[PDB]
Write a protein that binds this ligand. Sequence first.
Ligand SMILES: Cc1cc2nc3c(=O)[nH]c(=O)nc-3n(C[C@H](O)[C@H](O)[C@H](O)COP(=O)(O)OP(=O)(O)OC[C@H]3O[C@@H](n4cnc5c(N)ncnc54)[C@H](O)[C@@H]3O)c2cc1C
Ligand code: SF4
Ligand code: SF4
Ligand code: SF4
Ligand code: SF4
Ligand code: SF4
Ligand code: SF4
Ligand code: SF4
Ligand code: SF4
Ligand code: SF4
Ligand code: SF4
Ligand code: SF4
Ligand code: SF4
Ligand code: SF4
Ligand code: SF4
Ligand code: FES
Lengths: 296, 189, 95, 77, 137, 79, 662, 252
Amino acid sequence: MHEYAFFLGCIAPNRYPGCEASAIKTSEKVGIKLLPLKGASCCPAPGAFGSIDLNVWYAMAARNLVLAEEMKKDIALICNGCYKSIWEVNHILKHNDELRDNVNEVLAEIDMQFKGTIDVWHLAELYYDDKVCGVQKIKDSVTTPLSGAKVAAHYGCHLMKPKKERHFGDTENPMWFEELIGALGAEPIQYRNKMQCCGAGGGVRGYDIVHALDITNEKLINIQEAGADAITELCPFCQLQFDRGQIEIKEKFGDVYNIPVLHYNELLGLAQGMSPQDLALDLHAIDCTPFLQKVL
Amino acid sequence: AAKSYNIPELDKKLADRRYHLSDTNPEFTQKILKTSRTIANMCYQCGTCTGSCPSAPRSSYRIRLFMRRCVLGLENEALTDPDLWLCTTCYSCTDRCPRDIAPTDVIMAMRNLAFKRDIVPKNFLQTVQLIYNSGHGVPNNDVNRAARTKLGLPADPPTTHSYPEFVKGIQKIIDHYELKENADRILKG
Amino acid sequence: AAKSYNIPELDKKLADRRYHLSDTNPEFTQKILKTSRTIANMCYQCGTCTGSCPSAPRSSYRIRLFMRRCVLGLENEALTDPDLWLCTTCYSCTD
Amino acid sequence: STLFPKYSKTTDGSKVIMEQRLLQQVNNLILDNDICTGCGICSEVCPEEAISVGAVGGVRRGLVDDAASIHVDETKC
Amino acid sequence: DWKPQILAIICNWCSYAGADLAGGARIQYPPTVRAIRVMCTGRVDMLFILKAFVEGADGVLVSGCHFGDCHYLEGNYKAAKRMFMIKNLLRNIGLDDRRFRMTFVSASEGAKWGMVMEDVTNTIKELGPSPIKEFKK
Amino acid sequence: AFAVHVNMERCTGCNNCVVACPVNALELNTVNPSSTDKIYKVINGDAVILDVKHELCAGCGICVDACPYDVIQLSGQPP
Amino acid sequence: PRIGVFVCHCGTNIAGSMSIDDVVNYAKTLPYVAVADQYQYMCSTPGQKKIDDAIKEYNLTGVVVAACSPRLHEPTFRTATKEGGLNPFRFEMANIREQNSWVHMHGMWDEATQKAKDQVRMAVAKAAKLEDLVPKSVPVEKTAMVVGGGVAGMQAALDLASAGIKTYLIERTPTIGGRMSQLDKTFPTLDCSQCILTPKMVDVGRHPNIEMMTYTEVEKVEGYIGNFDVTLRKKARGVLTPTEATAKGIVGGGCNGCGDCSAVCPVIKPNPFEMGMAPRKAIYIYHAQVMPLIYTVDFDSCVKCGLCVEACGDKKAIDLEMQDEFITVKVGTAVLATGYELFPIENKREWGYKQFDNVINALEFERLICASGPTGGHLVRPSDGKTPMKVGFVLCAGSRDNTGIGKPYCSRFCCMYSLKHAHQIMEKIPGAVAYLFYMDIRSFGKMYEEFYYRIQHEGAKFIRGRVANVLEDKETKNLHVFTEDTLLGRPVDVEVDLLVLAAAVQPNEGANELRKKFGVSASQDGWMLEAHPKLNPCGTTTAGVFLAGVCQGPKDIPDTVAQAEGAASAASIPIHMGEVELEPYFAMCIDELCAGCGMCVNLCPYSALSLGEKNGRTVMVVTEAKCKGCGTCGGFCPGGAIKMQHFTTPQIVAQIDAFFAG
Amino acid sequence: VGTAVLATGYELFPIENKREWGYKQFDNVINALEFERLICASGPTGGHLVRPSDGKTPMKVGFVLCAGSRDNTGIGKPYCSRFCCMYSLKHAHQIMEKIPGAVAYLFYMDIRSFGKMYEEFYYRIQHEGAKFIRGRVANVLEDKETKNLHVFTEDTLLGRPVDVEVDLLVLAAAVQPNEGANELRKKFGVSASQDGWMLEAHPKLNPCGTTTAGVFLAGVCQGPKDIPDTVAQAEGAASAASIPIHMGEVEL
Ligand SMILES: Cc1cc2nc3c(=O)[nH]c(=O)nc-3n(C[C@H](O)[C@H](O)[C@H](O)COP(=O)(O)OP(=O)(O)OC[C@H]3O[C@@H](n4cnc5c(N)ncnc54)[C@H](O)[C@@H]3O)c2cc1C
Ligand code: SF4
Ligand code: SF4
Ligand code: SF4
Ligand code: SF4
Ligand code: SF4
Ligand code: SF4
Ligand code: SF4
Ligand code: SF4
Ligand code: SF4
Ligand code: SF4
Ligand code: SF4
Ligand code: SF4
Ligand code: SF4
Ligand code: SF4
Ligand code: FES
C-alpha cells in the first residue's frame, strides 16, 4: 500500500466534498493510502494569484511543498490547477538556484526551508502508472459495470501542457484518460476539439464571465453533438466551470444541455459501488439523475 | 496627429498612430525577459500562437500582437490593454511555438507589471483578501460544512480552516511582498 | 463565437472574429477589378501604401488592409467600414 | 515518413481481418475464428514465417477473448 | 613580480582553428597562455607534460577535438587516457593536479576558447607559483 | 508460454486453480514426472503465479474454467 | 644554423597591438638568429623578395616569419622559401596576429609585446632544429567511383567518363534517377521532370567508360588519395542481365524486360518508388522508365513459388537462389552523392499526418499528380477517392523549427515546389483553389520571383501564417486548418479537402554510415561537411573524396548539377596528373632503437604499422603511404624509436625549453 | 583558343532613379558596397563607420532591403538579387559589434536565408538584437539640421505606420549585369535571359554551357549567386570546357 500526502486544495473540500471522499475511499480500495496534509492551504492558484505576483506564488507553493517535506511523503493531487502550482514550483525550485535562495529567505521568516526532496503526482497519473495501481487493477476493483453510458472526457490544460514542461506525452490526441473511463465500463466518446480549454483558467472566470462562458459553450455544443451523457474531468476548476457555467449559460444565453459533470474519482466511486448520497451528487448544479438511471 | 491640442476628445480622435523610436522601453523589455524566464525577443511573428488561442476567435485579444509589443518595448500599450486579462493560460501557444517561446509566460510577466502600476481587475484583489483571511481562495461555508458532516467527513478539511495557526505564516508571506497593502489600497476608491 | 444568441450586445461582444471560406465574395472581387481597372489581386502586402498614406497616422484607416479585404472578397467588411471615406485620393500609394 | 502502406488488423466480430491498404488496391487475409481448430498446418506452411499459434485450448473453449487461435504478422505476410 | 607561466599544446584541426576563430572574431582574453601547435593531441607524449612541469610551468593545458571529431579518427582517445594518467601521477607526486587540464574545443568554438583561456588563467592565479621552482634549489 | 493474471482483490484462496492446473498436476500425478515446476501456489490467501517469465502455461483454460468467482484472465496475445 | 626572422605588420593589424621594433630587436639578440627584419605585408611580392634577398645575402639555413596563422599562409611562405635555395620545410611561423594582436588589442601593450617575444623565441627554437623533408608522391589509379545514381551522381559520372576516366556508378536501388525521377513537373520551367531526365539516363546506361552497378552497396573502404580499396556488396538481384547470362552459359539471353514474371507473380507489396501508394509484385521494376530494365526480385517477400521462372521460360533470367556477391575495386578518387529523404512529419502531431486520411506530404502529392502514378494522374482524396476542390499547402512543415522536433534550417526548395503544386492543381482541376499557409515565401533563384508572380496571378491564395493545428471533420473527412492571417490580423479556419505538408528534408538513410566509411565529417545541420564553406564547397578534408548534390545540403536540380560537375572536375584534377604529393609528416621508425615490442601496432587507426624482419631483429615497419602524420604512435613509443618528420620530440622539447628560457 | 569561359560578374543597379529614397540627394544615404568599403579596415576610414555628412559615428542604422528589387513598376528589377537579405544581416551584425550601443533596423519584406547555415545566421542576428520591421520603405525624408533620415513605412505585423529616425541609411540595391557585358556576350554569340543575364543551354540540366558550342558561363554573369554557388558554377564550367580539350576531337 503506497502512501501519499493528499493535498486537497480549495474547491474539492469546500464545494464538491464527494470528490475528496470518493478519492480517499477508492484510492484505499486500490493499493494507495492518501494521508491528510497538515495545515495545507490554497495552492496559490496559478491564474488568479500568479497573474498578480509570481514571487508570492513561489513562496506559497513552496510552503505547501515543505509541509509534505517535513511529513517525508510524496504529494498526491486531484486538481490540474493545483498540479500546475505545486508540481511546477517544485520542478522550478529544484533547478533554479537564485529562486531557491529567494524563496528560502522569504520562508526563513516563518522558520521553514525548502530543500526539494519529494515528488508530486496527480491521482489519475498514479491510477495509470503500472508500478502503482494500473488500468488492470482499476478494472479489477470495479464492481458495478456502468455499461451503456456515453462519457466525454475533458483533460484540462494544466496537467498535460506545455509538453516541453511535462512528461505525459502527446497533447494533440491523448487516450490515456479515455482508457481509465473505459476501465470503468463506460464507453468514452470523441467530440470535436476535445483538447480545448474550458475557459475558466487564468482568472478569466472572474474577469470576464461572458467570455469564459462562450469558451465553455463551444465545448458543451461539441459534447452534446457527440452524444455524451456525462463529462468526466480531472480538475475542480473545470468541474466548477462546466457545472455552474451550465446554469449561467442557461440564464445569460438560452442554451439548455443538462449534462452531468463528474470528477473521475466520483465515477470511480460509482463504479466501485459507493452510493450517490455518499458521493454528494446533490451538491452539483446539474442533476445527475438521468445518468444514474442509465448506469444503475 | 499634428501636435497636442488639449481638447480631450480631439486628442483621442487624432492620437498619433505612428510608431517612433521614442516609444521603445528597453527596460520594459528586460524586465519582461527576466520575469518570464523565456526568450521572448526571438519571436518572428509566425502567428501560430494566435492561431491556437481559444480567446482570439471571440475578442480582440492577439497574443502575437502582445509579443510584438514586448519585442518593441511598447510599455503603456501592452500594460493598459484591457485584453491582457483574457488569457486563460491554457498554454497552447507555448505548446506550439516554433521558437520555444512561452507567450503565456510573457503574459504573466506583463500582468505582474500591470499590477505594480495598479491596473488589475477586482476579482484578483478579492481573492487576495480571501487568501489573506483564511488561506483559501474558495473558502468553506455553513452549507458545505453540513454537507461534509452528512457525508461523514469532519465539518472542516484538514487545511488552515482547521489549523488556523498556519494562517499567520501565510499572512507574513503575503505581507513581505506587500500584496495585501496594495490590494486594499487599490480596492479603496 | 459559439453561435448566434440573439442578444444584440452579446452578439456584438462575441462576434466571430475568425475568417472562414464562406466569407469570400469572388463576385465582389471581380466587380472591384472591373470598376477599378487595376490589378488589385496582385498585392503582396508590402505596406508601402500605408507607409505613404497621409490619413493613416491620425486614424484607423489602412489602405493595405482594404487591399487585403479586396483580395479575400470581404464584402460587408470593406463596404461598411467608416474609414472608407478618409482617403483624400492623393495617389501617393499609387505613386 | 510515408503512410499509404496502411497495415491494419481488426477483429470484426468473429472474423479477424488482416489488411494492407493502398489507394485503390487492398489485401484481406481473413481468418474465421469459429472454424479454426488450432492446428499449425498454417504456421508450418507459411513461406514467409508470419503465422504463429496462440492459446489453442482457451480460444477453442471460449475462455479467451482478446486473441484468436493464430496470430498473423500482417506486416510480414 | 610573479606572472603565471601557462603552456598550451593545441591540435591543429580543432583547437588551433578555434583559437584562430576567436582571434578573428576579436574575443579578448588575458595574455598568459602560449601555445605549441601539434597536429593531433595523440602526438602529445606524457614526457612533454612532465618536462613542462619540471621546467616550471605553473599550469599546462592540452586542447583537442571533441570525442568522435578527431581529424585522425581516434587520436584524442589516446590523449585522453594519457592525460587521465598524468592527472593521477601529479596528485601522487604531491603537485596540485588542477595545474593541468585537457579541454575539448571544436573548430567553431572561439567563444569557448576565450572562456577556457580566462578560466585557466584564473585557476592558476588562485593556485599560485609552482613548488618545483623552489624545491630544486 | 502465455500469460495469466490473477485479480488479487477478489481471490478467496479457494486453491481450485492450483489443484486443477494440468502443469501443477505433472509432478505427483504422472508416471516418471517430466517437469516439476508449478504455475500457482496460494500464499497468504491469494493465488500467486510463480511462472513469472511465462514459460510453462499452455492456454488450457482449465484454471479459468475452474475458479468459482471468475478472477483469472487468460491472455492469448504476446505479453 | 642561421635563421632569419621577418616580422609582418599586416598593415597596422599587428603594429597597433605590439611594439614591432622591440620584437625585432629581441629577435636580433636571440641565439642562432642571423638577420631580423620587418615589413608591412610579408605575404606580398616585395615581402617574398625580401625573404629571398635575405636568404641569398646572409646564407640562411631557415626562415621564421612572425605573422598570421600557419593555416592561412604556410603554402605562400614555403614556396617563398623554396624560391631562394632552401627546402620548403626549413620554414616555421610564429602566429602573432590571430593569437596575439586581435585578442590583446585593448589596454595591454607591453603584455602583448612579451607574448610576441615568447612566440618568436619558440618559433626560432623549433626552426633551428627543423631539417629537410621532401613530399611523397604517390601514383593515382585512373578510375573513379560515384556513390549515388541520382541527378548529381549521374552528372558526375557522365562528366568523368566524358573526360575519359573510367567510372563506377554505385546505386543501392535497382535503378538510377533518384528523386527527380519521382518528380512530375519541374519548377520554374514546368518541364516534364521524367521526360527531361530520360536522355541522360540513356547516356549513362550506354557510356563505355561508366560501370553502372545498380542495387549494390559499399561495405568497406581502405586506402588514401592514391588507391582506395573499396569493397562492394552486389546484392542478390535474382535476375540476370543478358551479359551475365551469356557469361554463365545461357545463350538465349537474360532479362529483356517483357514483364511476364510480374504478370504471374502472386505476391503484392507496396512500391517504394510510388511512396507506397501503388502495388508491385515480388519481382518488379519501380517504373516503366527505369534505366537497367532488369526486374529485381524482392527476396524478403518472395515465396519461391517458381511461377516467375516458368513465365521467363527459355530466357532463364531468374535465379531464385542467388546470394550477395562481394567485389573489391581499386579507385583513385570518390564522389559522394547520397541525396536526401523527407523528415518524418508524423512526429508533429498537431498536423495529423498519419492520423487523418487526407493529409499527405509533398512527394506523395507529386506521385499522385504524375500521370504515371497510382492514379491516372488524377488527384483524388485518399479517404474516398473523390476529387478535391480546395487544397491547402502547409509550408515550413518541420523547418526553421527550434523546438527539437523539426529541423532548424530551411529546406531551400519547399516554397518553390509548393508553388508548382498549387499551379498544377489549379490547372488540372477546374475551379479548384489552392491555399498556401506560408511564413516567408523564398523564391530567390533565376525566374523564381516571376514564377511566384505567375502563381499569384493564376489565383493561389497566400495566407501569411504558420499553421497552428489541423482538425478532421468526423463525417466529410475534411480538414480544418487553424492559424492566424498575420497580415489580415485575424484568426482563420480554412476547410480544405486535401492538406499537403511541405516537409523538411534530411540526409538519406545510411548516409552517416557511408560518410563514416569514407572518413567525411558532418555539419552542424547534419549534412556532409565541405573543405572550406566558401571557396571549396565540393571537396572534403579527407583527400580524394568529393561531395555532390543534396547530400551536402538541400538544393534545386540546377545547383545540384553545378555542384556535381564541380566535384567531377575536382576528382579529375589528380587523375589527369597521375601524381599527387602527400604531406611529409609521416612516422619513421629508427630501427636500431626499436625493440620489437609491437605495442605501437594497435595505436594506428590506419594500420600503417606492422612488425617485420630487418637484419634478424624484429622491428616495426611504417607503410609511409598509409601513415597520415597524426603522431599517436610516436607519442606512445617509450624508447623514442618513432620519429615524426616535422614535429620531432627534439623540436617540440626545444620549443618548451625556449618558452621557459628567460 | 579551343573553348571560352565567360565570368563577367555584376554591378549595382542605379538606385538614384528611385527618388523616394534620397540616394544621391541626401548625404547619409549610401548603398551596400559603399557600406562594405566604409566598414572594411582597409577602406577610406580606419574601418570606422562614420556619417558622410559630418564624420560623426552613427548610433542608429537602417537597412532598406529589396531596394529596387521584386519591382514591377519598370524602374527597378522584377527579380530577387539572392544575396541582399544575407549581406544586410552581415552588415547589421557588423555595426552592432563595432559600434557599442548602436541599433540596426532592417525594413524587410521576406527575409530570404535559404542556404547552408543561413537560417542559423538569421537567428543569431536577431539574438544579438537587430530589429526586424516587416515593411517596404515608402519614402525617406532628411532632417534639415541634424541630417538625420526619417524612414516612413508601415510595420505590417504591428499594423501601424512607423517613422524611424536613423543616422545612416543603407540601401540593399539590386544587381544587374556588368557594364559592357552585353557587348561581350554578343561578341561571343551568347543570348540573354528574360532577366537580362546570360542564357544557359538548358535551365535545369545544363546551367553552365550555352547554345553556342565551346562557350561556357560561370558566376554572377549567369544570374546572382553567393560565393559558394559561384565557385561551384565556375568549376562546373571548367569541367565542361575541359571535356573537348582532353579528347582533342569534337564532332560537328
Ligand atoms: C517534393 C519535391 C519536389 C521537388 N521539385 C523540384 C522541382 O520542381 N525542381 C527542382 O529543381 N528540384 C526539385 N526538388 C529538389 C530535387 O529533388 C533535388 O534538387 C534533387 O533530386 C537532388 O538530387 P540528388 O542526386 O542530389 O539526390 P537524390 O535524387 O536523392 O539522389 C540520391 C541517389 O543516391 C542513392 N543513394 C543514397 N544513399 C546511397 C548509398 N549509401 N549508396 C548508394 N546509393 C545511395 C539514392 O537511392 C538516390 O538514387 C524537389 C524536391 C522534392 C522533395
Ligand atoms: S508562435 Fe512563437 S514565433 Fe510564432 S508569433 Fe507566437 S511567439 Fe512568435
Ligand atoms: S495561454 Fe493564453 S495566449 Fe496562449 S493560447 Fe492559451 S489563452 Fe491564448
Ligand atoms: S497595394 Fe500596398 S501593400 Fe499591396 S503591393 Fe502595393 S504598396 Fe504593397
Ligand atoms: S490615395 Fe492618398 S489618402 Fe488615399 S490611400 Fe492612397 S496614400 Fe492614402
Ligand atoms: S490453425 Fe491455420 S491451418 Fe489450422 S485450421 Fe486454423 S487457419 Fe487452418
Ligand atoms: S492455462 Fe492451463 S497450463 Fe496455463 S496456468 Fe491455466 S491451467 Fe495451467
Ligand atoms: S481459483 Fe480463483 S479464487 Fe481460487 S485461488 Fe485461484 S484465483 Fe483465487
Ligand atoms: S602575412 Fe599575414 S599578417 Fe602579414 S600582411 Fe599577410 S595576412 Fe597580414
Ligand atoms: S520474364 Fe524473365 S526476361 Fe521477362 S522481365 Fe521477367 S525476368 Fe526479365
Ligand atoms: S518465385 Fe513466386 S513469389 Fe517469387 S517472384 Fe517468382 S512468382 Fe513471385
Ligand atoms: S524553402 Fe520555404 S517552405 Fe521550405 S523551409 Fe524554407 S521557407 Fe519553409
Ligand atoms: S617502435 Fe616502439 S612501440 Fe613500436 S615496436 Fe618498436 S619499441 Fe615497440
Ligand atoms: S602517425 Fe603513427 S598512428 Fe598516426 S597514422 Fe601515422 S603510423 Fe599511424
Ligand atoms: S535577396 Fe532579400 S533583399 Fe535582396 S531582393 Fe531578394 S528578398 Fe530583397
Ligand atoms: S585532430 Fe585535434 S585532437 Fe586529433
